[PDB]
């Protein structure tokens, strides 16, 4: 009943790869139709086939601003207006202070923050039409935690936290929560920079309480908490979902 | 992820409010349910709605000579349990400049000492299963302070740091420990808030919903940490607030 | 002497009017030769004047990529490279979320978040050659707390929080501390808006723990606090000053 | 003028080793009138000795019940009734989880978060007709971070950042701000860690600038929160961590 999500329909961005992937798939294995948007359709292509009628493929830049209209007009052709919205798009340029061009900057802000307020801002009337509405950006231990060359992420990651209050603020009147996950170290594409080095990976899974770093599975009940009823009363958390990484 | 059956729950403080919702919610899930309370009619009332799944407990969790039988007694009906809900507490209300050594000293009995004692008795059945869920109860005034709330409010702080704590000596071992923290709900810690309805509607306009709390609205979040789908997160506080600190 | 500022130079963004303003009167008196930068000249004259010849006056848009590095040559001219960084500019286009705009946007994250960053970067060098710095970042109450009309504004302001963090890591090491001071409401260039309603006004200053609003004389302190070397072993910190705002 | 103490008392708590002594040698030279409060006289005579005639000494458990009435008066016999409070007695009994006594979780408990808070209870009405006070509490990485053996330690450190919260919300409007500095240190309460030398090097590489505390490092701290110049700051952690907690 709480975590159903049969005859609801999500957009998930950064859907063919990582964290975005496998959000799409537990989504369509509660029962949502699902729309993955991502840059390069052949992954996309292959998730769809993985889940099957349920899920469309979107092709868009979503830091683009030109392309905002129809990337929006395309995530609502096959299953019309989504009630659910993931922002699993990501970039991580990894420049240190010292070293932050104008370009890996404004790329990190466009993706990480800007990106998420206007697509989220688009898809909210319909929501507000239909009463309900779920929206999930991805927090970041680099949302309290400064590591080695993540000062543009981080800033974009802490960001990310007063943005999620500030939509719940706007909007959670109108039936629409706005929520962040904040995953720890998972095997995804803004990771593997970590997941190469085994020692560093080692020792980020003995900084958790748990002691070892997240499996994709781990990201399916969070996910589907905060896209279903059960999450009816959460809005504008930061839930971390990180074996106790912070806890330590 | 969420089914919650071959596994048995304790909840403290279940004779009421958020704790007898909790033991619904588990129970409905598959759970077997064990409520704890001071008070026998209430518990066999919701023994009665749930049925056989249910057993009632009566007993003082802040008593310290009270701590084996009540672990006993916990245990008797369905084994030692693998879920933990803490959701027993009291604020006194008592204002800085009026409280009493026994009120503050009753604050931080029930609120602090009675679930790391109680949960410390049920970690070892948990690691040898090496599955476990502790959930304690923060509040708005872990980070808010609200007038009248002054030794509520340092066992709530306290709970937050508990947890991550009772997160960082256990969760190695499958005991997840995580804390959900309600805002304005009608339950026997509140009706000083519900019966004053100025007040019950100030509280639910600094939400970001504009509403308060209904029981109905902690069974996800309970069930969330109660289950498989949390068991990447331990040590952490889910305000379950409508937006109340997001304002 | 933990306070003395004597052989120092601070550079204040945003001097020309409030907290900027009070911050380069503050840092004068502590010894301090200091350089307020702001957009008009003609407020810039007055503040010098009343200062004296230990104040500076720089005209530049310091949200101007085009102009860093003239911004950057001119602050460093009257009394070399600065020792001490306030960034006390910012913007609140006061836009709630459905009626947000690109520029109004844009040009939030490009005073708020970006124009730091990019500002303190080109001065960092000279402050790592002497082996001491001191970086202050404005937040916010909106850097935990969601008011209405803030979304651009809190997204910048919870982006500082991590910033400050993030400063702290790259730079810190080698003798610059980077910490954020947190205004509650002050009569100010941004808050006028909020003092200018009387009712609004009495409301936030009961919502504080000792029952006011701030007036520009509490800022004097804490400023100090965070660019002298009783703050040595303070970094990657934000300092509320809010009356209790944030406790209640 | 703003961080000038000449006319005010201080009365530091845990005044004899580490954070507390420092605090008491900091305040008396900004001017203060200093009351260090220890077990021992004789490491309060040392002290006393350094400070010369701005200091008096007095011996006491400030997490004895009995003892808080008579502790209360010996505290405002050599200079009137302090202006200034600094709680920096601690204890971290180290006890892991699964070990943790009745005996050591109790006396956490009634030294760090109980003792702040009967004693500043008991000085406030003077600082009230006065109409200025300042209250130091001190948090640590522990408000926020579990470490080993700190459970006991972490809840009331948890606790005392939600208690400083609740004395603003009670008292500032009288004049009386209420702030707790987080250390990140050689005293007294680390001394485990410092005859440690690996643990200390890392410690000191958890931090940001690279490096742990030296006791001057809190001197600019203590004397902004005790002083005019943190009249606007108040219920707030000031962690004193070298960026520990940024990373």
Redesign the interface.
């Known amino acids: 009943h ?2 159903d999500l049969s005859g609801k329909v999500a957009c998930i961005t950064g859907a063919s790869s990582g964290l975005g992937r496998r959000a799409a798939l537990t989504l369509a294995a509660a029962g949502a139709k699902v729309v993955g948007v991502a840059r390069r359709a052949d992954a996309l292509d292959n998730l769809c086939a993985e889940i099957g009628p349920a899920a469309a493929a979107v092709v868009a830049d979503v830091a683009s ?1 030109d392309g905002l209209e129809r990337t929006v007009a395309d995530i609502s052709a096959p299953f019309g207006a989504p009630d659910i919205l993931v922002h699993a798009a990501g970039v991580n340029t990894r420049e ?3 070293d ?1 061009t ?1 370009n890996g ?1 404004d790329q990190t ?1 466009a993706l990480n ?2 990106a998420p ?2 697509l989220s ?1 688009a898809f ?1 009337p319909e929501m507000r039409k239909k009463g309900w509405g779920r929206i999930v950006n991805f927090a970041s231990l ?7 060359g ?2 543009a992420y ?20 109108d039936g629409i929560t706005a929520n962040a996950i904040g995953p ?1 170290f998972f095997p995804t594409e803004l990771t593997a920079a970590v997941f190469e080095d085994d020692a560093r990976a080692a020792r980020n899974a003995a900084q ?4 070892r770093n ?1 499996t994709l599975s ?5 996910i ?2 905060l896209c ?10 930061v ?6 990484f ?3």
């Open positions: 709480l975590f601003r240190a202070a010292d932050v104008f900057w802000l923050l800007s307020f206007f801002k909210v680099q949302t309290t935690r400064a590591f080695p993540g000062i981080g800033a974009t990651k802490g960001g990310i936290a007063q943005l999620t209050r500030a939509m719940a603020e706007a909007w959670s009147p720890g958790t309480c748990i002691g997240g781990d990201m399916d009940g969070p589907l908490f279903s009823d059960a999450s009816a009363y959460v809005t504008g958390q839930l971390m979902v990180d074996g106790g912070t806890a330590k």
